[PDB]
Structure formats: C-alpha cells, structure tokens
Amino acid sequence: KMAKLYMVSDASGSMRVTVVAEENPFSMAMLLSEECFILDHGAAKQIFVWKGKDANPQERKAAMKTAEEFLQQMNYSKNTQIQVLPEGGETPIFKQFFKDWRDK
Amino acid sequence: KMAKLYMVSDASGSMRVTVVAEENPFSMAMLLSEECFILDHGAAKQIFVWKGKDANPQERKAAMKTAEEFLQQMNYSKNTQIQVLPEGGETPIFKQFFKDWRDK
Ligand SMILES: [Ca+2]
Ligand SMILES: [Ca+2]
C-alpha cells in the first residue's frame, strides 16, 4: 500500500494541512522541525503524527485532531493504529517509510 | 507515580473533560464504550487516549486534542509518550493500571 505525507502548520497565518509528498519512500529532509506532519498509511491500518521539536502548541493539537479527521475523511476503520511521535522519538516502522533516515 | 483517569464526552450536550478516578489502580468498568478516556501518567512520561467503540467522531477528535492540551496544562515535556488505543486494542502497559482487566 502507498503512503502519503502531509504537513500541519499555521506558519501562513492560519492552520493548514497540505500535501508535501504524494508517495513513499520519503526523504528525511521533508520533516521540518518547526512543523507537524501526518504520515498516512491508513489503507495498511497505520497513521503517524510526527511533532517537530520547534512546532507550536496550536500545531501540535491540530496534528492530533487531523489524524482523527483522516479516519472520517478517508473512511478508515475505527481500529486504525495512530502512532504519536515527537521529533527524535521515531520508531523503526516510521523510519521504514524514508529512503535516507539518518539518526541525530 | 500516581495516574489519573478522565472521561471525554459530549453526552451532556457539550464537550466535557471530567475526572472519573483520582488514583490508580482503576476498575475496568470505568471505561464506558460510548465515550473516550484519558489516562494521565504524565509524571512518568506516559499519556493514553482510549477511544470507546461507540464514541462519536467529535469525542474521538476532542480526546486526541485533550491529550496534547494536558502537556501544556500540566507542564509535561514535549517528549511525553502519547499512546492511542481503540477499545479492544489495549496494550499490556495500559491494562497494568487496572486491578481487574478482563479481555473480551
Ligand atoms: Ca510551525
Ligand atoms: Ca459518547
């Protein structure tokens, strides 16, 4: 199944959910420390919320809400696994979507 | 460290976050299938969002947002682990807070 990467940010003056990569494998550089991201692999029962260390509280809350909205918007089941990852606390399964993950 | 159990529900006509148990160990019967719950063990770096199989989309979104609000409200670090559990998909660590967990 093919995953999609979204950015959750209010850096534009309003809270926006935008597509940053249509298909995996993704590049690690796509994850910006100042924002939050949603990695949607809902067709394979998995969504990840990634929270940049420099993302603000509004963005962090919006990213959590957005993961839940995806279940309704894309008609994913209630049993969809949602993983919540702070920047630096990423799991091997999350890293697996990236062609060039380099640990800091 | 001592955990606290909260209910996230709009069954009253408005979205409310209420205390259902001040201290662990909790009773499994406290988890109502029609609502969402937050198990706060933030002092030990762990928060759990539990989503009842019969909870509505508004409650599910509010519970996700609430876990993030707890970090700001209780001054927990950005590295606090947040586990998201659908009813029936509970982890051993979540079950460990209950004196009488009985799998269905
Ligand atoms: Ca930002
Ligand atoms: Ca309800």
Author numbering:
A (entry chain A), B (entry chain A): 247 to 350
Per the authors:
Unexpectedly, attempts to crystallize the active form of A1–A3 in the presence of 5 mM calcium led to a structure of Ca2+-bound A3 following protein degradation within the crystallization drop. Attempts to crystallize the active form of A1–A3 (aA1–A3) using a 5-mM CaCl2 supplemented protein sample led to the appearance of a single crystal after ∼80 days, from which a 1.8-Å data set was collected. The conformation of aA3 is highly similar to aG3, with a r.m.s.d. in Cα positions of 0.82 Å over 93 Cα atoms, and differs from inactive iA3 and iG3 by the position of the second β-strand and the straightening of the long α-helix. The structure is stabilized by Ca2+ coordination at the type II binding site, which involves interactions with Glu280 carbonyl, the carboxylates of Glu281 and Glu305, and three water molecules with bond distances ranging between 2.3 and 2.5 Å (inset). As previously noted for gelsolin, this Ca2+-bound conformation is incompatible with the formation of the A1–A3 latch, suggesting that calcium binding at A3 moves A1–A3 away from the inactive conformation through straightening of the A3 long helix resulting in the disruption of the A1:A3 interface. Furthermore, the structure of aA3 obtained by degradation of A1–A3 in the presence of calcium indicates that A3 may exist in a conformational state where it is distant from A1 and A2. The predominance of Int2 at high calcium concentration may explain the slow degradation of A1–A3 and crystallization of A3 in the presence of 5 mM calcium owing to the increased accessibility of the A1A2 and A2A3 linkers to proteolytic cleavage. This crystal structure revealed the presence of a single calcium ion bound at the type II binding site, associated with the straightened long α-helix that is characteristic of the active forms of gelsolin domains G3 and G6, highlighting the similarity of Ca2+-induced conformational changes in both proteins.
Adseverin (also known as scinderin) is a member of the gelsolin superfamily of Ca2+-dependent actin-binding proteins, which regulate cytoskeletal dynamics by severing, bundling and capping of actin filaments. Adseverin is composed of six GH domains (A1–A6) and shares 60% overall sequence identity with gelsolin (G1–G6). Adseverin was first identified in chromaffin cells of bovine adrenal medulla, where it acts as an actin depolymerizing agent that disassembles the cortical network of actin filaments in response to bursts of intracellular calcium, leading to exocytosis of secretary vesicles. Crystallographic studies revealed that these binding events involve the association of eight calcium ions, six of which bind at a conserved site on each domain (type II), whereas the remaining two are also stabilized by contacts with actin (type I; refs 17, 18, 19, 20). Both proteins are able to sequester two monomers of actin, as well as sever and cap actin filaments through distinct Ca2+-induced domain rearrangements of the two halves of the molecule.
